[PDB]
Amino acid sequence: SMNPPPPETSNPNKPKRQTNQLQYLLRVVLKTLWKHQFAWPFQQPVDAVKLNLPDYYKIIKTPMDMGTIKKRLENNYYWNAQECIQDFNTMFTNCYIYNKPGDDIVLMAEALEKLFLQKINELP
Numbered sequence: 001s002m003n004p005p006p007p008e009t010s011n012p013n014k015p016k017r018q019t020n021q022l023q024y025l026l027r028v029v030l031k032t033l034w035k036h037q038f039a040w041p042f043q044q045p046v047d048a049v050k051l052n053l054p055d056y057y058k059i060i061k062t063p064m065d066m067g068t069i070k071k072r073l074e075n076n077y078y079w080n081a082q083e084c085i086q087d088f089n090t091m092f093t094n095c096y097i098y099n100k101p102g103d104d105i106v107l108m109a110e111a112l113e114k115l116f117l118q119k120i121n122e123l124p
């Protein structure tokens with residue numbers, strides 16, 4: 001199909017370890033973006049088939065979405081907060097490199113990214 005297998009969300013060979021920053025990323029950062037009115041296009045992998053975007057996964061080499069990030073946090077996939085922040089950054093980058101500037105989806109991403117950066121500015 002137009003769609004790749006979704007990203008893995010569990011790392012079983014990794015030890016399970018909480019950190020203050022990972023708790024913050026799940027319980028403050030992800031939670032705040034997840035509940036936002038503009039979160040909905042970002043809560044699951046882009047379904048290029050249903051959306052008829054045949055070039056999406058030609059342009060986007062590293063798919064990422066908030067649902068994947070949420071599950072990765074819930075399964076303690078990330079070794080540290082920077083790995084999680086990188087996935088958020090990738091999700092926004094994908095939106096900005098695929099969609100035309102000023103598209104509704106880009107304006108949605110920009111609003112979510114601003115909130116993300118504001119919360120990251122207070123990472124413990």
Ligand SMILES: Cn1cc(-c2ccc(C(=O)Nc3ccccc3N)cc2)c2cc[nH]c2c1=O
Pocket residue numbers: 040041042046047050051094095098099105
């Ligand atoms: C990240 N991202 C997401 C999306 C994206 C857009 C729409 C949906 C979606 O579920 N639409 C919908 C609304 C109401 C009823 C049924 C459906 N299917 C999901 C995703 C997208 C589209 C162009 N470009 C991007 C884009 O970059």
